[PDB]
């Protein structure tokens, strides 16, 4: 089936201590989200660059993790129903707040946690390169030679193109069908691993430390081992979803060369170019493409989506 | 009267070459905007820090211009009517595009140019500290001892607190009156120079290099001395504005100590605290406070607003 | 009117980490005291020297913050009624104990928090030097040219002379009137900003971590995220107060030259010398003069005292 994705965004300092606490406080949070029965998986990325579009963004590069001061992190979290997210965040509030507040000594911006729904998916299951001679055997056994996937190495061995679009009111489903068609054509590139399209449906306030007046002061004067009341969030998830339709396109690639030259096929390939020029005529903003590196993942989520 | 403010936002590399081209291409653009008769002034800022709210943003500091990789710039531009902006941007298109594209070799993000209207203003006119013995003389001459302002040094000798809020649908005018009242109380701080409140009304597409399909390719493959057609912008200014109403609060201070301890009066002062806790109960996001430094300005704009 | 001042005294290590936690845990505590309605303001000082009285204290100097191992800090806190202090300290006990115990890794002595009442006050309101052309305008408007004050820069731009006296039983009101008269004469110095006289009325036990037997062990074996019972304080505020009446004289000066040569006027000026020699004939101990530097302040307290 299709899960929803809550994405937790933050910007942190780029010190070694930041990565130490990524390695320490990272897994623990993941263990508190698994207490709910609707949780299906997770994936954690760090930004490593921006695709420069030639010289449209002349000061950006596909590798900037060396000469930089701030590192931006995005956590994907996959749910069967988006109310599972809102009922897990507030039943494990004591653990979650203190864990995520141990992280706040290094933050420059955020967190901001919006909620998206999957309107399209082409994601294969991940495997190692020692895990593929026993996968094609099972497929040729059951007489299914047309459903053997591409090898998709887990645990930080592939890149993600993270494209942000915002769409004019009155062009939404046009955008949706055009982008689906262009991905159908684009899956032909040498290195394409999978893709999905996400449509923003709302914003979570408890996951973004966004309280009313009483909770804001409790957040400001927190020594570390106390919590605000989680019911002091003034709005609900669908109450304030942004009017320009915000969409994410998440494409996977084997390496940054494949990323650079495959995402550029929509510019160089005349068929794909004419197909993609109906995406452009609906955008308020975009596309803005980030290059993400997946540090860790609950790979089993891809099982649920393909069951 | 009240002008509108178009704000041009960008993120650039933090090299010395960036500041060289700030000093060179900066004034020239300003000379092309002055060709329209509705242009009333301008102000240019660079971000120098983030107010950490104690340790809410633990990795931020009021001075980060040293240990950083990217510098964010915001240009204010003041218009009598927001259609003056849309008719100046496209009658000087040849000069403007090439000037602003000479800048694109150093950009990491943007530009994004939204359009705001002034709903409140308390801005005094700027003066040097050698310019104040001839100002009180004219005021005491005309028997007006209650309208002598505070000294507000121009050309980079004061700080700006740039607070971003977004408001829940259904709480807008409540936010407006509450924030006006809290600024009325807050003008008592030791170092307060002035303040204004801006309400986002739309987004300009020509000023953000946001074209359709035909113009996007012309932007991508531009050697430098060519222009896209400026009428290939798919949307108009009011067509796409955000669901949470985006407000800016722009407060001026003599120095960063006054900024740190005056913007904190809303937290420490019980009267001001209880007045300000009606602002907080309407926010989808915020407040997020940046510290800006004004490198240059068309100070005469403050004349028009106070005439 | 007149508030009471609770003064929190401590001695800490003089490392950079001490100042880091001053900048971090400092504001947060200040935000927890503002929850009571009787709280009117605050002021925080660090000791930077001792006035050597020629060579009476030959090893002391007006600047010792460089070659030193321990830094002594004094917090002033201003209350309408001294029971406001005792009812705020124990209703916010959970926040306050953990905040002030995060500080205990660097302490050499204290804290000791005695409670004083204001018997005399001459404190003007603080202003920046860009804030004074709009202050005299309002005063000349309302025909009040004799109540325009001296400029008193906030946020660490002035020095404090902190003089400690103790008075023989049977000489108290003699001391009081003599010191008031000598301050009336002394306000003539070139650089005098203001002064106040405080008379010690008692000691707070909850604010000095002074519990009985049950609470002392809870303080000793505290991991950090627990609290003693705040009602295990064996004595009340007026129960214990020193037999020699403890007085503080708090004088403000523009700079340490003005401090050195203005506090010495009582020695060099024959009129002031003969007036001040009735202060000396009542002292058990003193005067001992410290030089304080105000790092931060809730300046609005000076409004309440002058309303
Ligand atoms: Fe969440
Ligand atoms: Fe513009
Ligand atoms: Fe106390």
Residue numbers in the entry:
A (entry chain V), B (entry chain D), C (entry chain A): 2 to 308
Please give me the paper's original passages concerning this structure:
First, we determined the structure of the Sulfur Oxygenase Reductase (SOR) enzyme that catalyzes both the oxygenation and disproportionation of elemental sulfur in Archea and is composed of 24 homomeric units each of MW ≃ 35 kDa arranged in octahedral symmetry. The resolution of the final cryo-EM map was 2.78 Å according to the estimation from the Fourier shell correlation (FSC) at the 0.143 cut-off criterion. The average root mean square deviation (RMSD) between the cryoEM and x-ray crystal structures of SOR is 0.575 Å for the 307 Cα atoms. The core structure of the monomer is composed of eight β-strands surrounded by nine α-helices. The catalytic active site in each of the 24 monomeric subunits contains a mononuclear non-heme iron site, where the Fe3+ ion is responsible for the positive charge of the inner surface of the hollow cavity in SOR. The density of the side chains of H86, H90 and E114 surrounding the iron center, and that of two water molecules ligated to the Fe3+ ion are distinguishable in our cryo-EM map. Besides these three residues, there are three conserved cysteines; pursulfurated cysteine 31 (CSS31), C101 and C104 that are present in the active site and complete the hexa-coordination of the Fe3+ ion. The extra density in the cryo-EM map results from CSS31 existing in two rotamer conformations with equal occupancies. The characteristic feature for SOR is the presence of chimney-like protrusions at the 4-fold symmetry axes. These tetramer channel structures formed by the side chain of residues at each of four adjacent subunits are proposed to allow the sulfur substrates to access the inside of the hollow sphere cavity of SOR, where catalysis can take place secluded from the cytoplasmic environment. The exit routes of the polar products such as HSO3−, HS− and S2O32− are proposed to be the hydrophilic trimer channels formed by three subunits positioned along a 3-fold symmetry axis.
